[PDB]
Design a protein around this nucleic acid. Structure first.
Ligand SMILES: [Mg+2]
Ligand SMILES: [Mg+2]
Ligand SMILES: [Mg+2]
Ligand SMILES: [Mg+2]
Ligand SMILES: [Mg+2]
Ligand SMILES: [Mg+2]
Ligand SMILES: [Mg+2]
Ligand SMILES: [Mg+2]
Ligand SMILES: [Mg+2]
Ligand SMILES: [Mg+2]
Ligand SMILES: [Mg+2]
Ligand SMILES: [Mg+2]
Ligand SMILES: [Mg+2]
Ligand SMILES: [Mg+2]
Ligand SMILES: [Mg+2]
Ligand SMILES: [Mg+2]
Ligand SMILES: [Mg+2]
Ligand SMILES: [Mg+2]
Ligand SMILES: [Zn+2]
Lengths: 64, 211, 25, 95, 125
RNA sequence: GGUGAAAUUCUUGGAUUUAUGAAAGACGAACAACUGCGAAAGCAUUUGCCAAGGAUGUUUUCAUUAAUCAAGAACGAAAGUUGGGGGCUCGAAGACGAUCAGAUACCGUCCUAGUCUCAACCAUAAACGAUGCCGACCAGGGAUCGGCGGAUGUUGCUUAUAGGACUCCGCCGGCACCUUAUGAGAAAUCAAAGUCUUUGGGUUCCGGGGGGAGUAUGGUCGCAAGGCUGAAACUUAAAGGAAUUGA
RNA sequence: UUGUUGGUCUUCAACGAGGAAUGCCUAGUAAGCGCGAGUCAUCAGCUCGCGUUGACUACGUCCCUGCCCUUUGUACACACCG
RNA sequence: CCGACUUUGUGAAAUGA
RNA sequence: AUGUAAA
RNA sequence: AUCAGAGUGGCGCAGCGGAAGCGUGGUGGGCCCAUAACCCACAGGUCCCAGGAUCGAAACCUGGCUCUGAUACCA
């Protein structure tokens, strides 16, 4: 029973993927605002977007 | 499945400042698989940082031997020591010489053990030369000094005073004070003290060191 | 290694030519 | 044609150099020819270091570090981009 | 109250092995492949994520509150670089609710080892 | 376990993992290098012993005793051979599981000989610096290895100094490297492959287009594998080296 | 005439959104809808123009196919279909 | 080859009753 | 994997 | 000479009456510049020749053909 948690995209680091189709962003957690994690995001995403996030403790790695 | 397990309190001898290094557990004492005599020889792996309440000695793991239990309270005596691998790999680097030695020692208490010593030359200040190598005969000379000094410091009373020479790093800091006439040898140490063959149980001998 | 394996072929062939001579000796 | 001055290995004054094993394919290449890097990595990368200083029981504790001297052959070094094919002129420098 | 977490972090799999302070009794041994369907997922860092979450829960349900970590690679005559699951296991096993006492690498490193699998030219693929 | 993914394989007769310990045999990490020694092959744990060795130093000796060397001789990696010891790891052959059209291969598991040691053979490697050996001259520099000489200036040393480490300067003898043609070269490149048509220091070996071929035959050595010595017939107009542009 | 075409009544097929594969397209664009011209004595399912209605997706990447530059390798030059 | 009884006595512990 | 003899 | 065994897709072969397939081969697309290879579809046969019984045969029995394998010994 994970409770879906929220983040804001502070900066868009890049655009990874074989076909360059998974944005790699750096998210900051709303519920406790000192946790910043690098995640993968698909589709158009800009700065300040709020992302719902089912499972939290996974993170990506630079140029995944 | 984990309900027939009782914990036990591992308490270290009086030659260490801190006590109660940890908690072990055994199956409840039956007969034929009695717990007390059944295990009786745990070898715990505990750093010396939490036995001296410091962080300068965060390296220098001590391995301690469980040798008796007294009423839900596990006695212990020293059984050996070593560096942490991060420590040793941090010390050993390029562009210098690594010096090592080893000796068998029989302390007055009927214990046989082995000493491993290690050393590394210094770059003196103003040394413009990129490297610091000895010349394979001074290596042998200071290896011979380490042998002589370490056996000299040994042939003492007991593991008590031997280990309390270990604790303040006696051996190292009077290896270079014995050989700064050949090379400085920054980071002289004793990596490993291997207790080869202990004499016997000797509960009385245990008791005053471990009270 | 075409050079090496040509050498090995001639080694085998010369061994077999030798055998035919210890036959017709 | 001779591709390099020293042959890709620094062997002068010797006749035989003890071989070693590539850390990836285990190929036996001489110790003076293998691409040898002394990698010293953190136990965890810097995005997970605050989170372990928030879990170390005793304060003032510093993270250990992985020291390891990895060896590669030329094949695996090229393939994994440890080293790269450089121009005829840039090839020579050792910096 | 202290335990010891032997994190065997090789490739192809990852082991998280918790014992008492002596190494003679395994309180819990959760394996990355116990928590996935794929014989290729068995080595990914995610497998170590959740297989460490369950270590933490079965560790709270046994009592020991702080943990001496001891990481270890394949060792011997093989790689000495921990598998992908090492850092994932530490990351998840610290933040799932737990206390880490002391980190240390106990990977087997030989003074010099026996001959290594692969032959002279080695694995050429 | 293993891989990209698999399966062969091990496993509730408790594998994998953890700790303690014992046996076996192998290997000697990191230190470890444009570093040393060795005639080359080669030689990295410790101490002892045994002989040997280059350099350095020398106001010691002999006095040309020297250089290179057909015949002849010593050593000569790995493999391999005869026979003991050992039998960990790894592993030709062999057997499997994959892949594939095939897969007698690369990949994964088991593995014999072998890997190790002894006694005795063998005599070849891209045995390489693809660069014989001794000698002289010629261009510059900083490194570094060993020895020696000279500097004051600090040692977590030294009953004080000397000496050891370190800084500076110079000699020899090493292993090399960086810059430049005024040189050489087909150029690549080379401070020795220079001092070559302005051609001559000495000496040994060795090549005469490509194949046939290090083959046949003869000899000789070897237990054998093979080694050393080694043609012809015929065929061919190119084969080959270096560098340029393009693909 | 092997019915040029256009009407009228009747005849009322397959086709249930199409396998492997593959094409075109980034804003009045795709797609839907008609008109005009070319051909023409007649025949427009075509081609070239024209407007009408009017979007989803993306604002990327070198993974597939290719292109340009540099480096590198080459036993290729009719040039890797070597 | 192994099983039981017999020579075959003594006391001690741990598991079944 | 491979690539007219038809110049 | 007797006695078994087997005659099934183009080839080698599976089949237990309701009743026909497997690999491969062939035919048509697809990928490729083109051929393989690979992906997707398509069509198969006088179930050796001639009878019978059997709801129901290629199978079951029998007659005819062709190959193969055995046994043909004491004198
Ligand atoms: Mg030398
Ligand atoms: Mg060699
Ligand atoms: Mg077990
Ligand atoms: Mg040296
Ligand atoms: Mg060593
Ligand atoms: Mg030769
Ligand atoms: Mg030669
Ligand atoms: Mg000097
Ligand atoms: Mg000729
Ligand atoms: Mg050429
Ligand atoms: Mg018209
Ligand atoms: Mg037309
Ligand atoms: Mg296309
Ligand atoms: Mg040509
Ligand atoms: Mg081709
Ligand atoms: Mg062909
Ligand atoms: Mg076809
Ligand atoms: Mg085709
Ligand atoms: Zn490799």
């Amino acid at each position: 029973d994970t409770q879906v948690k929220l983040a804001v995209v502070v900066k868009v680091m890049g655009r990874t993927g074989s076909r360059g189709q998974v944005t790699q962003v750096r998210v900051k957690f709303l519920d406790d605002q000192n946790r910043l994690i690098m995640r993968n995001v698909k589709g158009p995403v800009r700065e300040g977007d709020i992302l719902t996030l089912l499972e939290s403790e996974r993170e990506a790695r630079r140029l995944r | 499945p984990f309900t027939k397990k009782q914990w036990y309190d591992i308490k270290a001898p009086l030659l260490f400042t801190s006590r109660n290094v940890g908690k072990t557990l055994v199956s409840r004492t039956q007969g034929t698989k009695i717990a007390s005599e059944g295990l009786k020889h745990r070898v715990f792996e505990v750093s010396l940082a939490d036995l001296q309440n410091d962080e300068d000695q965060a390296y220098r793991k001590i391995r301690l031997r469980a040798e008796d239990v007294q009423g839900m309270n596990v006695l212990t005596n020293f059984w050996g020591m070593d560096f942490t691998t991060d420590k040793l790999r941090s010390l050993v680097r390029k562009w210098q010489t690594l010096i090592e030695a080893h000796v068998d020692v029989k302390t007055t208490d009927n214990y046989m053990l082995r000493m491993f010593a290690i050393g590394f030359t210094k770059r003196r200040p103003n040394q413009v030369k990129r490297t610091c190598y000895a010349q394979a005969s001074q290596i042998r000379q200071i290896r011979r000094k380490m042998v002589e000094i370490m056996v000299n410091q040994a042939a003492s009373c007991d593991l008590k005073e031997l280990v309390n020479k270990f604790i303040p790093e006696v051996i190292g800091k009077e290896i270079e004070k014995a050989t700064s006439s050949i090379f400085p040898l920054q980071n002289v140490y004793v990596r490993k003290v291997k207790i080869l063959k202990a004499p016997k149980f000797d509960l009385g001998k245990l008791m005053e060191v471990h009270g | 290694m075409r050079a090496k394996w040509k050498k090995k072929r001639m080694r085998r062939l010369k061994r077999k030519r030798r055998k035919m001579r210890q036959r017709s000796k | 044609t001779f591709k390099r001055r020293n042959g890709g290995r620094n062997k002068h004054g010797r006749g035989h150099v003890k071989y070693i094993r590539c850390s990836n394919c285990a190929k036996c290449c001489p110790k003076d020819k293998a691409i040898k890097r002394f990698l010293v990595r953190n136990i965890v990368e810097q995005a997970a270091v605050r989170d372990v200083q928030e879990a170390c029981v005793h304060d003032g504790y510093v993270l250990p570090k992985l020291y390891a001297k990895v060896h590669h052959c030329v094949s695996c070094a090229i393939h994994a981009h440890i080293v790269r094919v450089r121009s005829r002129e840039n090839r020579r420098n050792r910096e | 109250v202290f335990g010891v977490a032997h994190i065997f972090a090789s490739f192809n799999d990852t082991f998280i092995h918790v014992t008492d302070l002596s190494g003679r009794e395994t309180l819990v041994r959760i394996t990355g492949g116990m928590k996935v369907k794929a014989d290729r997922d068995e080595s990914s860092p995610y497998a170590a994520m959740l297989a460490s979450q369950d270590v933490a829960t079965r560790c709270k349900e046994l009592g020991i509150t702080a943990l001496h970590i001891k990481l270890r690679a394949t060792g011997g005559n093989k790689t000495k670089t921990p598998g992908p699951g090492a850092q994932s296991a530490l990351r998840a096993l610290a933040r799932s609710g737990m206390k880490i006492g002391r980190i240390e690498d106990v990977t087997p490193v030989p003074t010099d080892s026996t001959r290594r699998k692969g032959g002279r030219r080695g694995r050429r693929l």
